[PDB]
Scaffold this active site. Structure first.
Site, PDB file in Angstrom:
ATOM      1  N   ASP A   1      18.857  19.914  44.963  1.00  0.00           N
ATOM      2  CA  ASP A   1      19.117  21.160  44.880  1.00  0.00           C
ATOM      3  C   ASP A   1      17.525  21.450  45.942  1.00  0.00           C
ATOM      4  O   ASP A   1      17.974  22.434  46.939  1.00  0.00           O
ATOM      5  CB  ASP A   1      18.859  22.059  43.692  1.00  0.00           C
ATOM      6  CG  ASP A   1      19.748  21.605  42.613  1.00  0.00           C
ATOM      7  OD1 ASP A   1      21.009  21.258  43.084  1.00  0.00           O
ATOM      8  OD2 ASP A   1      19.959  22.312  41.485  1.00  0.00           O
TER       9      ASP A   1
ATOM     10  N   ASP B   1      25.093  23.463  37.340  1.00  0.00           N
ATOM     11  CA  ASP B   1      25.760  23.712  38.660  1.00  0.00           C
ATOM     12  C   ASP B   1      27.261  24.026  38.635  1.00  0.00           C
ATOM     13  O   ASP B   1      27.832  23.133  37.947  1.00  0.00           O
ATOM     14  CB  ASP B   1      25.294  22.869  40.054  1.00  0.00           C
ATOM     15  CG  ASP B   1      23.761  22.582  40.187  1.00  0.00           C
ATOM     16  OD1 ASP B   1      23.279  22.235  39.160  1.00  0.00           O
ATOM     17  OD2 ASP B   1      22.975  23.288  41.004  1.00  0.00           O
TER      18      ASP B   1
ATOM     19  N   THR C   1      25.557  27.886  43.497  1.00  0.00           N
ATOM     20  CA  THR C   1      26.936  27.084  43.416  1.00  0.00           C
ATOM     21  C   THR C   1      27.800  27.830  42.329  1.00  0.00           C
ATOM     22  O   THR C   1      29.071  28.047  42.486  1.00  0.00           O
ATOM     23  CB  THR C   1      26.950  25.621  43.258  1.00  0.00           C
ATOM     24  OG1 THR C   1      26.386  25.187  41.984  1.00  0.00           O
ATOM     25  CG2 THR C   1      26.253  24.716  44.526  1.00  0.00           C
ATOM     26  N   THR C   2      27.267  27.956  41.139  1.00  0.00           N
ATOM     27  CA  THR C   2      27.750  28.761  40.258  1.00  0.00           C
ATOM     28  C   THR C   2      27.749  30.347  40.364  1.00  0.00           C
ATOM     29  O   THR C   2      28.763  30.810  39.752  1.00  0.00           O
ATOM     30  CB  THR C   2      26.648  28.504  38.854  1.00  0.00           C
ATOM     31  OG1 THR C   2      27.207  29.131  37.598  1.00  0.00           O
ATOM     32  CG2 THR C   2      25.234  28.530  39.266  1.00  0.00           C
TER      33      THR C   2
END
Lengths: 517, 513, 509, 508
Positions: free
Chosen positions: A380, A49, A82-83
């Site tokens: 998540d 993440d 998120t990444t």
């Protein structure tokens, strides 16, 4: 003095973003390649993440500092991707640098990015459905469960962790609005079992205090007496010895403890409830006596720990032993004691069907490493279903949505021309970085695989046909079973664009040498 | 190894950087060069076309630029500077793709696919004028003249060009008409007014004295023989060791030649044209003065050009020695004219020559050596523009404006192509838009702002309009007198696509020992 | 602070791993070349080992990828026992072969994904190389012997090794139908000879009390208890500390004295002859036991006191929560004998005759300690070989057979997975080459011969590094179990794939 | 790779050789004294090999094995401490050769033990038995060894005394092993070498007690390792002062305590007590001591930790570290306890006659000046060490360095017959041997290579012939002048040496 001015300052920025971007790029999808953070004590951790890795990371530049905040908002609503915001934000700049070299200002492009975001979302909305109900969103949630587990702690679906994870969120949704937060739901982990030992808790779980493994363990009623007042004399979180000065007063002190066990046991009984939560404690001997007398205490409860139970029950905690009535205690729908660990002592489950404002899904783990990964999957999961409850849509995402939008935004550069033309061109290739770098990390060429999916974008639109994201010979996204929320992918598009708008604002490239301290 | 990676990056850097300097084309831009050579000579240059042909380099990648210009002149004779600048665009494409991880063989392939699509779209936008029809030819010729130095000798020049090419022409849209048939001769004297189109074959040569045949009837002479006379190629037993004895040998030598030239005239010769290279001295220097008397034309040490044209067009073949009499394999002829005009100039015209249905000659006249030069360049380009239509017809935008136009239409075709090759071609569409930009950039100061702006104005006009590149202003570019032939821009793309592709192909260092 | 990008991360990772693989490749197997342990950061004293496990703990490493290797090595020591060094070498080898693939153009996932399919094929091959042995008592003896002798040499102790192998296999042999170690006590104790060693058939506490207390009991009755005398386990019969006087110091000492004695009485009321206490026995209750007729053993172990309780048929008191109300144990005889120059207490006639104690007799402390560990790794092996009584042909014979299995697979395949299969086979095969150097006999000849056998199909020739030639394996004193090997193959791979997968190494130091 | 251990190992070998070079010229009686500079800036003059290595060594891993190697030599023979270093470094010269050739280190280490096993055979055949129960045979073998040692001046007088101690500790024909764990070296101020004597019991150091009895017969040997007073406060005593009153309150506890202890000892029956220092026992009372002496019990107070562990084995007076453990079993039986103030000034406790396991002898060595006492302490040590070596290993071999050539020559020939890849290792090892008698000959003074070539040829034809002779400096028989060494003293030099060279080769 030193001065990076205009163009120079802008070049510096580009160098920061593409290094951050690339670390994230080789972590895209479940074909991802893990992150190892080593700290300043040399303690090793394995995470995934964008949001988490940045937060740990000591910021070395200005764009790096900007991304941490950005990521944390993606993490809260969406809890995935998120990444992928970060990869898109840096990427878009890496192209802006190429536009810069041609002789376009960063000003012109940056306005046309906002427009190019607006057209990308528009295209998105056409892709996949926008109508589900909550007993039918479950099949995409199973598709989300495959990928989310199988890149973190395990490389496989686990149907037990997934199904526990999705219920918890639904319990809170039906209490208010069809909306949940990220403070009304929590993953609390405590080590003792294995990752597959899990529970669905409908309220909260507290450690249940027992003096010995020869004392009685009972539970009864369906209701919790939340107190700060005594259920047996205090010993309020400080050292105490015995300060008697005669034999006489020692003998005296024991019979006085016997009566107070009885009298509190009855006062709670009478109002209703007979399991007590008391913030204070008392030594080991007095506790053992009360457990023998029966109707189990919970002793040595944290100052936060009592606040947690109260918020979830919705009721109040008494400041006093005088004032007790059933009203003034919190409301539970069941109290039952469950075996925590698999060779450890029992805990107290307080489930609630009365009110819910904190629903914990109790996860057990072996090691510190294997629990932290396992909870990463849970967090998540909580978040993707939060999007569904509020408005029910999903998109096929992993590569499918991005490329379809990309082709769309490309085409309008040539319908429009003018100001936004360059901005559109750069925005359409940025979107295509996302399937591409996913193949880079993965076993198969990035150029070749991108080319494959792009062919099927001209042949057919709104595709269930993206790139591999189970590391397969075939390429779909229906048979690779990656689904995102439509809002989730939508939120990425906004965020990436955002980063560009923030760096543009002022013209203060002036530094005294203070600009990252 | 490391030999293939580093060579490709530098060679591409090194041509491209020179191509950046070179890109100052069209109109008044950059700052002049007075050039101190590597051999210590002073040289002054102007004009982009003239420079590129002349350019003396030793970097293997940059030599490609020199020769690219020359091929263009031979097929089009238009767009000679243009073809180099757009080639530099393709080089700009090649670096960005290496970083992306698209292999060099792939970038070669894409150039072909860029060519195939591009030229088809050029033919689409083009308005198809007829290549045998004079009116449209006459407008087009004005376009090229008015873009060169002339603006008042343009009046004379447009109609002569439509007539000249008409003589050589072949009806088809196939490749015909050349400057191997269009013969271009200079003459000191006359004026730009007096320039003369002779439908036959006229050769440029120098003829001794003034006082010679300027009338009709001639047998055109193509000889490869030296005389037989005393102290030439016939025996003499008189050996000199005195000035007096020298005088005798030369007298009897010249005397026999006075007889000889009568047999040359018996033939019908009023034109004789001597071989380039001697077989002793050829016809002697004495023979030439005697020939002049018979009324018969001369030129010893003839240029290469004349020998090629005479044999081909008129069918003129070598003939036997004069004492042995001429073989009579000479072609037909009917004019031996020594063209004098305003007191100067020596020339041969051959009228009533046999032809294969080709071969015109234009005579280029000017009262001063610079004034001939001024006719010469301008006419060259006007002949060539009409020429380009026969070879392959039609008119598209001129000045290199359809390469900017082509960029919009072409991006679309790449996206829907959806290959490996698509990305290479899309990136080239954006590079063709830099050509008015880059041109201006180098001259001054403040580069960035203007650079982005010219691409907006051209693009927004759409597939039928943009900025003009010979007047400025957003107006229709497809017909407005800012035109050039289809041939010029398709040819330019074609030549570029081949030369550039070659840089990508090599691997590892190579240097013959 | 520093963000190490995927390639740059690979090199640090590789070099980390490899630096470690050299040390443990040399230590490997019975003829393996020693390590010198160097105590860093504090002094610079030395000890010599041949144990791969010890290299890591004593001498640490600051390379992030090399730290994964350390975590992995811990897991072998306890669960499997042997294979702590054997794993660490293969994992470094897998990465070495990885190097050429990352360079070429090939991404880390390609290499990972194809080694997972390869691990499944290698496992199938481990089953094939695994022939059943030690189903019958005769064969069962022969079966424990081979594995146990392997372990000791590889973790150091090879001089007095054979004597300990006889006692260790006999110990496991008694159990029968269960892999206990929860009755097989391990006692390492100063006194005795390095040559002599003893297995008592019963249970043995090495703790003594002198000849000043009873030690001869016939028809013994056992109380197992945790009873304080100064620790002060509950069932207090003393006083609270309070201070009211300047002579009060005197009062405390007396109050402890009535405490010690009242507890002696409650013990006494069980009706017993043998009392065992984990805790201290003060000078005052000690004398009161010797008079009562009751044996006193003080300073019993937390492992042994509990473990004693099961075998004899007692039950523990658990912090003195049972002062008369816990069931006894029973033995036929309690004799004090002198074994070595020591006095031992010998429980004999133990209820569950499964129980045995293996008593290690040192006469150099350096040997006695290293011996305890190496023999514990060996007993971990032994007890898993009860659950499945089978061996694989060790020596390099299995490693080649897994390599070859994976080579035939490799050939079939032309995809992305196929690439790594070539790498994986080479990795497995690269372990006997190390074993070949350890022999001291050139690698190329032996390993090539070995290769040839296994293609045709043979597991009845292996590498004898104890003859320096290619030789028979027919369950000799140089085979390895199936038990050790399955776990060693699984972990080497698993560690290597985690090192591959981590290329986003952010070091904040 | 194994490249980097290869590079480390050569560096280690070179450092070890350099330190070992100094000792080759310190070898034998003709050895060259070494002036050694400490990190303390003091010059130390020694000719004993072992202490040079110990007092300062370099910081390389092979250098450390050398200190260890000679330390091991001392316990095993006590002799050949100098020679054992010589063979170790000489072997490491041989190894470089093998390595380059492509003989792997594993081969050279097993071959080096195999060559020891093979060496010992050849040695024994040469060796010749002597009696181990006869006083005279052990003395001649010990006397020859003493001339070779550094110390010799008073060793004439100390040699018959060294045998006498050892003879009593030999009781069966096997002659046991005889360690120094039974022969005790005690020194006493004043007296001569002739006054030295072998006391049947043990002689103990110091003697504190002047209120006690001074001669008690039929004594019982009691051992104190428990206190005589209630524990520390701030002194070894429970009593301390900071107020007048404060001392009183501690005294109430102490007074009670000192009477019950002193009385408890007497009730069990003891007339010798062995008491340690006031820094090795947490309390002792002067008050408790005055009474304990005045009950008529003979006391020595003040003695070492080392002494207390020594007594416990030898005279069977086992630990008594608590009140509970004084029982009859622990006590000894002494025939006499006596104060002697003759034969050297100062008072020591002699217990003459003791009931003992094994048999324990003590030699009170003595001398006129402080340095005379130290020379004789060295002299008994040297003398006793050789006797113990011969009783372990009955046969007798020659000194002078001749055995060392004789093994080598046989070991070369045999290796070639046997053949194998390891042939090179055993042949080079034998040539390693040729260095030590050669190095010895140089110190005796005669061209060294020429000396060792000639002795080889004498051994080849005759066998038992010439050796290095101290008179000649060179080549003359050692059959005409007996130079003997015990069989264990040479077995030790070789087997220890090989083990050290084995570890270094194995070491990464």
């Amino acid at each position: 003095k030193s001065r990076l001015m205009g163009l120079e300052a802008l070049k510096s920025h580009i160098m920061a973003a593409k290094a951050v971007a690339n670390t994230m790029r080789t972590s895209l999808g479940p074909n991802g390649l893990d992150k190892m953070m080593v700290d300043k004590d040399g303690d090793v951790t394995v995470t995934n993440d964008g949001a988490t890795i940045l937060s740990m990371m000591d910021v070395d530049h200005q764009i790096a500092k900007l991304m941490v905040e950005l990521s944390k908002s993606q993490d809260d609503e969406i809890g995935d991707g998120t990444t992928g915001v970060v990869v898109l934000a840096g990427a878009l700049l890496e192209e802006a640098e190429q536009l810069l070299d041609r002789g376009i200002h960063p000003i012109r492009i940056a306005d046309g990015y906002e427009q190019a975001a607006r057209v990308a979302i528009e295209h998105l909305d056409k892709i996949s459905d926008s109508v589900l109900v909550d007993i039918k969103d479950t099949e995409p949630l199973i598709q989300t469960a495959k990928t989310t587990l199988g890149s973190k702690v395990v490389n496989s679906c686990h149907r037990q962790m997934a199904e526990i994870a999705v219920n918890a969120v639904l319990t809170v949704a039906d209490m208010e609005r069809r909306d949940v937060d990220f403070e009304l739901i929590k993953v609390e982990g405590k080590v003792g079992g294995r990752l597959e030992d899990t529970k669905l808790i409908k309220g909260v779980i507290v450690d249940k205090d027992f003096s010995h493994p020869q004392m009685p363990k009972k539970v009864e009623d369906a209701k919790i007496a939340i107190l700060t007042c005594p259920f047996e004399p205090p010993k309020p979180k400080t050292k105490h010895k015995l300060d008697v000065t005669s034999v006489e007063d020692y003998k005296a002190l024991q019979k006085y403890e016997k009566e107070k066990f009885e009298e509190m046991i009855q006062q709670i009984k009478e109002t209703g409830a007979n399991l007590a939560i008391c913030q204070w404690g008392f030594d080991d001997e007095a506790n053992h006596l009360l457990l023998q007398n029966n109707l189990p205490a919970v002793r040595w409860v944290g100052g936060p720990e009592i606040e947690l139970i109260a918020i979830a029950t919705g009721g109040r905690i008494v400041p006093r032993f005088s004032e007790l009535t059933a009203e003034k205690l919190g409301f539970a729908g069941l109290v039952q004691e469950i075996s925590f660990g698999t060779t450890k002592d029992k805990m107290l489950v307080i489930e609630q069907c009365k009110n819910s404002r904190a629903v914990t899904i109790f996860i057990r783990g072996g090691n510190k490493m294997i629990i932290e990964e396992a909870k990463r999957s849970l967090h998540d999961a909580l978040c993707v279903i939060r999007n569904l409850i509020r408005d029910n849509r999903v998109v096929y995402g992993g590569g499918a949505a991005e490329i379809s939008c990309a082709l769309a935004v490309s085409q309008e550069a040539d319908k429009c021309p003018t100001l936004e033309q360059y901005a559109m061109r750069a925005f359409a290739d940025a979107l295509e970085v996302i399937p591409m770098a996913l193949s880079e990390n993965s076993g198969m060429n990035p150029i070749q695989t991108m080319t494959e999916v792009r062919a099927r974008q001209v042949k057919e639109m709104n595709p269930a046909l993206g790139i591999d994201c189970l590391h397969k010979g075939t390429n779909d996204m229906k048979q690779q079973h990656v689904i995102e929320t439509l809002i989730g992918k939508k939120q990425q598009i906004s965020l990436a664009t955002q980063m560009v708008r923030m760096i543009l604002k002022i013209d203060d490239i002036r530094k005294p040498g203070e600009s990252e301290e | 190894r490391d030999k293939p990676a580093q060579i490709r990056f530098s060679n591409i850097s090194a041509a491209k950087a020179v191509a950046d300097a070179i890109r100052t084309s069209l109109g008044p831009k950059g700052m002049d060069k007075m050039i101190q050579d590597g051999k210590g000579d002073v040289t002054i240059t102007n004009d982009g076309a003239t420079i590129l042909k002349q350019m003396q380099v030793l970097h293997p990648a940059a030599r490609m630029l020199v020769e690219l210009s020359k091929a263009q002149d031979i097929e089009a004779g238009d767009g000679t500077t243009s073809v180099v600048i757009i080639a530099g665009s393709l080089l700009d494409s090649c670096t960005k793709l290496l970083q992306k991880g698209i292999h060099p063989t792939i970038i070669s392939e894409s150039f072909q696919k860029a060519l195939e699509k591009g030229i088809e779209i050029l033919t689409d936008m083009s308005r198809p004028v007829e290549l045998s029809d004079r009116e449209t030819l006459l407008n087009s010729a004005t376009t090229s003249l008015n873009s060169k130095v002339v603006s008042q000798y343009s009046s004379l020049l447009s109609p002569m060009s439509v007539n000249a090419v008409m003589k050589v022409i072949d009806p088809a849209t196939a490749t015909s008409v050349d400057l191997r048939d269009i013969k271009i001769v200079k003459k000191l004297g006359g004026t730009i007014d007096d320039c003369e189109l002779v439908e036959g074959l006229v050769l440029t040569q120098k003829v001794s004295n003034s006082g010679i045949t300027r009338v009709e009837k001639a047998k055109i002479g193509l000889i490869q023989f030296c005389l037989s006379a005393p102290k030439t190629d016939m025996d003499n037993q008189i050996v000199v060791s005195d000035y007096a004895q020298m005088d005798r040998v030369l007298r009897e030598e010249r005397a026999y030649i006075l007889n000889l030239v009568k047999q040359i005239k018996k033939t019908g010769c009023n034109v004789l044209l001597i071989q380039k290279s001697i077989l002793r001295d050829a016809l002697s220097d004495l023979a030439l003065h005697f020939l002049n008397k018979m009324k018969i034309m001369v030129i010893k040490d003839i240029e290469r050009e004349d020998i090629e044209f005479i044999c081909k067009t008129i069918g003129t073949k070598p003939v036997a020695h004069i004492d042995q009499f001429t073989a009579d394999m000479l072609g037909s002829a009917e004019l031996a004219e020594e063209v004098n005009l305003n007191g100067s100039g020596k020339l041969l015209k051959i009228t009533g020559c046999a032809s294969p249905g080709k071969t015109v000659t234009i005579v280029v006249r000017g009262s001063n050596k610079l004034v001939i030069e001024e006719a010469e360049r301008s006419i060259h380009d006007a002949l060539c523009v009409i020429r380009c239509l026969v070879k392959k017809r039609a008119l598209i935008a001129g000045g290199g404006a359809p390469e900017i136009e082509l960029a919009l239409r072409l991006t679309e075709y790449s996206r829907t192509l959806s290959g490996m090759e698509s990305y290479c071609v899309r990136a080239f569409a954006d590079a063709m838009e830099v050509i008015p930009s880059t041109l201006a950039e180098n001259a001054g100061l403040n580069p960035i702002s203007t650079v982005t702006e010219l691409r907006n104005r051209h693009a927004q006009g759409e597939k039928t309009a943009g900025i003009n590149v010979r007047k400025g202003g957003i107006s229709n570019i497809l017909e407005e007198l800012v035109v050039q032939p289809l041939l010029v821009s398709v040819s330019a793309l074609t030549l570029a696509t081949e030369t550039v592709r070659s840089i990508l192909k090599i691997d590892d260092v190579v240097n013959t020992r | 602070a520093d963000e190490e990008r995927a390639e740059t991360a690979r090199l640090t990772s590789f070099i980390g791993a490899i630096a470690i693989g050299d040390l443990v490749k040399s230590t490997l197997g019975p003829k393996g070349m020693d390590k010198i342990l160097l105590s860093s950061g504090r002094d610079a004293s030395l000890m010599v080992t041949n144990d791969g496990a010890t290299i890591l703990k004593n001498i640490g490493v600051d390379n992030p990828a090399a730290k994964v290797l350390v975590d992995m090595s811990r897991v072998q020591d306890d669960e499997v026992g042997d294979g702590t060094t054997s794993v660490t070498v293969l994992a470094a080898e897998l990465l070495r072969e990885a190097e050429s693939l990352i360079a070429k153009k090939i991404h880390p996932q390609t290499i990972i994904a194809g080694w997972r399919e390869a691990t499944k094929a290698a496992r199938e091959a481990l089953l094939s190389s695994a022939v059943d042995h030690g189903s019958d008592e005769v064969k069962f003896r022969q079966d424990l012997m081979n594995i146990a002798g392997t372990t000791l040499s590889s973790k150091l102790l090879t001089h007095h090794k054979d004597h300990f192998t006889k006692l260790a296999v006999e110990a496991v042999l008694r159990l029968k139908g269960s892999g206990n170690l929860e009755a097989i006590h391990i006692i390492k104790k100063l006194g005795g000879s390095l040559a002599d060693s003893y297995l008592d058939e019963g249970f043995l506490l090495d703790k003594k009390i002198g000849v000043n207390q009873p030690k001869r009991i016939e028809n013994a009755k056992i109380l197992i208890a945790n009873t304080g005398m100064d620790t002060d386990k509950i069932k207090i019969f003393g006083s609270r500390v309070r201070v009211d006087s300047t002579a009060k110091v005197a009062e405390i000492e007396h109050a402890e004295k009535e405490k010690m004695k009242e507890k002696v009485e409650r013990i006494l009321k069980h009706g017993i002859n043998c009392f065992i206490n984990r805790q201290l026995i003060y000078n005052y209750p000690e004398q009161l036991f010797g008079a009562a007729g009751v044996m006193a053993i003080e300073h019993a172990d937390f492992a042994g006191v509990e473990r004693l309780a099961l075998v004899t048929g007692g039950e523990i008191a658990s912090t003195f929560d049972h002062p008369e109300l816990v069931k006894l144990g029973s033995c036929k005889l309690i004799e004090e004998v002198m074994i070595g120059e020591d006095k031992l207490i010998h429980f004999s006639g133990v209820a569950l005759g499964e129980a045995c104690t293996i008593v290690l007799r040192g006469a150099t402390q350096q040997i006695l300690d290293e011996a305890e560990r190496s023999l514990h790794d060996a007993l971990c092996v032994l007890a898993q070989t009860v659950k499945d009584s089978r061996t694989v042909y060790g020596g390099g014979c299995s490693e080649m057979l897994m390599a070859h299995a994976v080579t035939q697979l490799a050939n079939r395949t032309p995809g992305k997975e196929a690439v790594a299969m070539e790498s994986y086979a080479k990795a497995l095969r690269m372990l006997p080459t190390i074993i070949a150097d350890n022999a001291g006999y050139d690698s190329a000849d032996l390993v090539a011969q070995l290769r040839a056998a296994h293609s045709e199909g043979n597991t009845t020739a292996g590498l004898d590094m104890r003859e320096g030639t290619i030789g028979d394996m027919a369950i000799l004193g140089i085979t390895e179990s199936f038990q050790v090997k399955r776990q060693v193959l699984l972990s080497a791979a698993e560690a290597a794939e985690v090192i591959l997968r981590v290329d986003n190494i952010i070091k904040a130091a």
